[PDB]
């Protein structure tokens, strides 16, 4: 959620177990947050496909795993979309797994399907970290 970086977010998620999680390498998680919020902790969206909103470095859609001002939501993660723009990357990653295991998957993260899952780039985590 805080002002992280390409390798910083990649090494942090790798330690928790997001590296290659469900076939999604560390780059998939970094490029997704690098385009959705651009490593900005206050970067968030107001209107989405269903009038939802994104919050935190991952910018999670407040409609299938969080309650917000989007006229009620699925709240699958059971957490309001208010404590997601803090300087800690623990709750943003805890609910991030719920968005991937749900029926939507990486589809909710446009930056992911448009800059990693769909965009096959060979310069993301390859030219980062060690």
């Amino acid at each position: 959620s805080k002002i992280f970086s390409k390798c910083e977010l990649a090494r942090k998620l790798k330690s928790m177990g997001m590296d290659g999680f469900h076939g999604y390498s560390l780059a998939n998680w970094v490029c997704m947050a690098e385009y959705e919020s651009n490593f900005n902790t206050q970067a968030f969206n107001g209107r989405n496909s269903n009038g939802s909103s994104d919050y935190g470095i991952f910018q999670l859609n407040s409609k299938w795993w969080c309650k917000s001002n989007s006229h009620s939501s699925a709240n699958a993660c059971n957490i309001m979309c208010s404590k997601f723009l803090d300087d800690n990357i623990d709750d943003d990653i805890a609910c991030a797994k719920r968005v991937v295991k749900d029926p939507n998957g990486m589809s909710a993260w446009v930056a992911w399907v448009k800059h990693c899952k769909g965009k096959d780039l060979s310069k993301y985590l390859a030219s980062c970290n060690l």
Side-chain angles (χ1 to χ4, degrees):
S1 189
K2 63 184 273 178
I3 299 136
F4 244 32
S5 284
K6 271 192 278 179
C7 162
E8 173 75 83
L9 201 138
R11 307 253 287 206
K12 202 81 163 156
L13 257 78
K14 166 256 201 182
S15 198
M16 94 86 76
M18 235 61 172
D19 62 285
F21 188 76
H22 276 233
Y24 305 135
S25 196
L26 281 173
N28 276 269
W29 299 106
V30 183
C31 69
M32 145 150 97
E34 175 216 87
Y35 227 87
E36 263 270 74
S37 83
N38 272 222
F39 305 116
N40 212 90
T41 187
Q42 304 135 118
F44 81 98
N45 208 49
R47 62 187 155 98
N48 249 92
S49 189
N50 304 268
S52 314
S53 40
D54 294 314
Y55 296 105
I57 190 132
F58 264 28
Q59 265 212 17
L60 293 112
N61 287 54
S62 62
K63 191 90 229 211
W64 321 79
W65 20 73
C66 177
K67 294 267 265 185
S68 199
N69 304 155
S70 82
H71 302 96
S72 192
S73 286
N75 192 228
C77 217
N78 256 213
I79 183 78
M80 275 162 181
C81 271
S82 286
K83 267 201 168 190
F84 267 92
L85 297 110
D86 306 286
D87 274 274
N88 84 286
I89 188 150
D90 197 85
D91 65 279
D92 267 80
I93 306 307
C95 267
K97 206 190 90 174
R98 186 103 224 194
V99 183
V100 172
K101 68 100 103 182
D102 258 294
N104 241 93
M106 64 238 161
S107 184
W109 274 303
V110 175
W112 191 349
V113 302
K114 298 214 171 167
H115 218 243
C116 261
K117 197 75 194 137
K119 184 199 150 137
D120 286 271
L121 187 86
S122 287
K123 214 171 158 197
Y124 38 32
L125 263 267
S127 204
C128 275
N129 57 272
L130 270 87

